[PDB]
Write a protein that binds this ligand. Structure first.
Ligand SMILES: CC(=O)N[C@H]1[C@@H](OP(=O)(O)OP(=O)(O)OC[C@H]2O[C@@H](n3ccc(=O)[nH]c3=O)[C@H](O)[C@@H]2O)O[C@H](CO)[C@@H](O)[C@@H]1O
Ligand SMILES: *[C@H](C)[C@H](O)P(=O)(O)O
Length: 419
């Protein structure tokens, strides 16, 4: 059990970071490569334990996989169709294997994900999406088992609710169905756009991505090809917040402002000087007062739930109260009790956190529990007085490529410690 040991400072975090490819685009694209009959190259793939878990599932199902800068997949030989209980419990994104397997091979099993602390996370929309495409699905011994006789069939699918995951499941599966799929009330996240762009690079016909209505005209087989994953907008946001809450200046390279306009506008609302270029974003906080903002999480292009913990920290440190309402995962406030151990002030009322003022943080032992809660704990440790120990940081390594190297380059004192 790795830990982060952090020596806090009042010196601003400043300098440059180079942004990695989006975890949340890399993962679905890797599962979508289960559709592909010829070799695939996915470039700009972050080095994350979820990418490792994905590669290990891909290999288990029969694809030949290897990596470094790119990930290389030869899925021609896929010859197994189960995502085991052990693998799904380590990462629920493995649910994405169900769609391509059933659409390509007419059969697939994926363990049904268990409980998650951040809120109810059912997969009813994924199942119902596949049923509308012609799948027969049953639950048996904790397994979602899907079958179709022959090919899936294009259907008009109106999603009950906006879901990123379920959008990816029906979109990817629709690429191999006979005829046309119209997916209505689709999620508009950039990683949906990136996956659809990847499906097109491999021979699919997906249009409307980035809109509330995606059109997929199915083909018999997908080929292979090349695709460079979009930059991680949430890693981008995270470093920009690091700069803002510490009063520093940072340039995030290999990223793009169009992926996080909501976060950028709020960082300006919070008093930061945000500038952008062709593939960079900079924030300057030097000589500027941090003011609290109100935030309401919602689907893209609104402010992202994946930035909410990071902005709870910002508001906590900023002058003023700041109200954060979570409409996506109504219980994603596990970082708050940990931050309160460091002397942060906030009240939690239902799905609303009201962030107070504090004079400053004070290092303590705190525990990572989910990806973004962790990142906010690491950042707080960098700005607290004294030594913070963040335990169970394997959570962070699921979602960030060597965050401690990138923070070190911005002037942080952070050590990865083993046991
Ligand atoms: C691996 C990955 O890409 N994960 C991201 C993805 O997760 P994920 O794809 O699970 O998130 P969804 O957009 O599907 O979920 C949004 C809401 O819809 C609900 N829901 C979802 C599916 C379903 O079948 N039924 C249902 O009720 C969920 O409980 C949640 O409250 O989008 C989230 C919202 O931006 C991000 O926080 C995650 O980092
Ligand atoms: C729900 C279970 C959370 O996302 P995880 O960090 O446990 O995967």
């Amino acid at each position: 059990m790795d830990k982060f040991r952090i020596q806090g400072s009042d010196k601003p975090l400043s300098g440059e970071v180079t942004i990695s490819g989006a975890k949340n685009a890399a993962l679905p694209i890797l599962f979508a490569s289960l559709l592909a009959e010829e070799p695939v190259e996915v470039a700009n793939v972050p080095k994350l334990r979820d990418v490792d878990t994905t590669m290990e599932l891909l290999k288990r199902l029969g694809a030949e996989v290897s990596r470094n800068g790119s990930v290389h997949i030869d899925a021609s030989g896929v010859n197994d169709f189960c995502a085991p209980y052990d693998l799904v419990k380590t990462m629920r994104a493995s649910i994405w294997a169900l769609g391509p397997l059933v659409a390509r091979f007419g059969k697939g099993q994926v363990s049904l994900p268990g409980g998650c602390a951040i809120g109810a996370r059912p997969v009813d929309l994924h199942i119902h999406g596949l049923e509308q495409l012609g799948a027969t699905i049953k639950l048996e011994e904790g397994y979602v088992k899907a079958e179709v006789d022959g090919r899936l069939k294009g259907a008009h699918i109106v999603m009950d609710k906006v879901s990123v995951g379920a959008t990816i499941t029906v979109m990817c599966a629709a690429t191999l169905a006979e005829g046309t799929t119209v997916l209505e009330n689709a999620a508009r996240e950039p990683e949906i756009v990136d996956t659809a762009n990847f499906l097109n690079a491999i021979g699919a016909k997906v249009s409307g991505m980035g809109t509330d209505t995606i059109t997929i005209e199915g083909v018999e087989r997908l080929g292979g090809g090349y695709h460079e994953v979009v930059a991680d907008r949430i890693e981008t946001g995270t470093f920009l917040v690091a700069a803002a809450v510490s009063g520093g200046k940072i340039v995030c390279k290999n990223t793009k402002a169009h992926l996080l306009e909501a976060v950028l506008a709020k960082l300006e609302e919070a008093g930061a000087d945000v500038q952008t270029g062709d593939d960079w974003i900079s924030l300057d906080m030097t000589g500027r007062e941090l003011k609290a903002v109100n935030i309401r999480t919602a689907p893209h292009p609104a402010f992202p739930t994946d930035m909410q913990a990071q902005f709870t920290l910002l508001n906590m440190m900023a002058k003023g109260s700041g109200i954060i309402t979570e409409t996506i995962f109504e219980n994603r406030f596990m970082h708050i009790p940990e931050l309160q151990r460091m002397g942060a002030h906030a009240e939690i009322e239902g799905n609303t956190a009201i962030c107070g003022d504090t004079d400053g943080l004070s290092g303590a032992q705190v525990m990572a529990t989910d990806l973004r809660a962790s990142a906010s704990l690491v950042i707080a440790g960098c700005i607290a007085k004294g030594e913070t120990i963040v335990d169970r940081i394997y959570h962070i390594d699921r979602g960030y490529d060597k965050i401690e190297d990138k923070l070190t380059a911005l002037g942080a004192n952070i050590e990865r410690v083993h046991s």
